[PDB]
Write a protein that binds this ligand. Sequence first.
Ligand SMILES: CC[C@H](C)[C@H](NC(=O)c1ccc(C#CC#Cc2ccc(N)cc2)cc1)C(=O)NO
Ligand SMILES: [Zn+2]
Length: 267
Amino acid sequence: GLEKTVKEKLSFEGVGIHTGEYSKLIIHPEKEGTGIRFFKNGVYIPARHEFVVHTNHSTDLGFKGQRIKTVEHILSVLHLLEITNVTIEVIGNEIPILDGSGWEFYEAIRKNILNQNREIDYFVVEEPIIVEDEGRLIKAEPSDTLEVTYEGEFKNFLGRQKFTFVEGNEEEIVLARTFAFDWEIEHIKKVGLGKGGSLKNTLVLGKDKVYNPEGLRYENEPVRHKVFDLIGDLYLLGSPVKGKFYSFRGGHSLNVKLVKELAKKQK
Ligand SMILES: CC[C@H](C)[C@H](NC(=O)c1ccc(C#CC#Cc2ccc(N)cc2)cc1)C(=O)NO
Ligand SMILES: [Zn+2]
């Protein structure tokens, strides 16, 4: 496809899932060739792997002492819509979690797409590659389209699950919420994560139940969300991606490890 930006400024506001702090986003149009970058306190922070500064339960970006937490969801939506040139101005310390999924971002941005002149410079996976970490694995291989599978194993009623995204089916993942398990709640709070979490923005799972009043959106919503996360982390390659991906129990750390190896292999 062709490069894209937004037709006009868009803003989003709300609590961040981990900080519990209120923040605001303003998405600014940019011309062809600009790329995706964040902006905070006078500092531009490109949405690229070189600027990743944390990968524990979220992907955080930083530069010159300016940090932005949890970029993976907004990046995933921008990757799926192939928005290639914007500046995401951030006031605060974290991207708002909103409903827990990509939906509100997706809905608003989809309505405001502006086509540009330049052909997208896709990052094309050119040969098989695999990264591993003690029973976690991500592999990639060449493909003309973006296809992403995540397979997980959960110590509850979900059991082993997997989902495959194929180009054109973004509605099957953009509403999958971020999630947490009830037995991990005490820990994540002790280490200061999930301070903004609630049943209004997080799928909370138990041994044989879901805490949320509305329950699961899909029987395999958590692995759908993991696919959504991986597509967000893949956009740290610096442009939309063409390849077939399989992640077994991968997290943001392994996701970014894959991106870094792909970048290193290309050069
Ligand atoms: C690694 C992938 C993972 C899914 C990740 N999400 C998280 O790490 C995560 C960790 C903790 C929470 C939380 C909370 C809470 C609550 C709460 C609710 C109701 C009551 N009554 C009380 C408390 C949410 C998300 C993610 O999406 N990354 O992109
Ligand atoms: Zn996520």
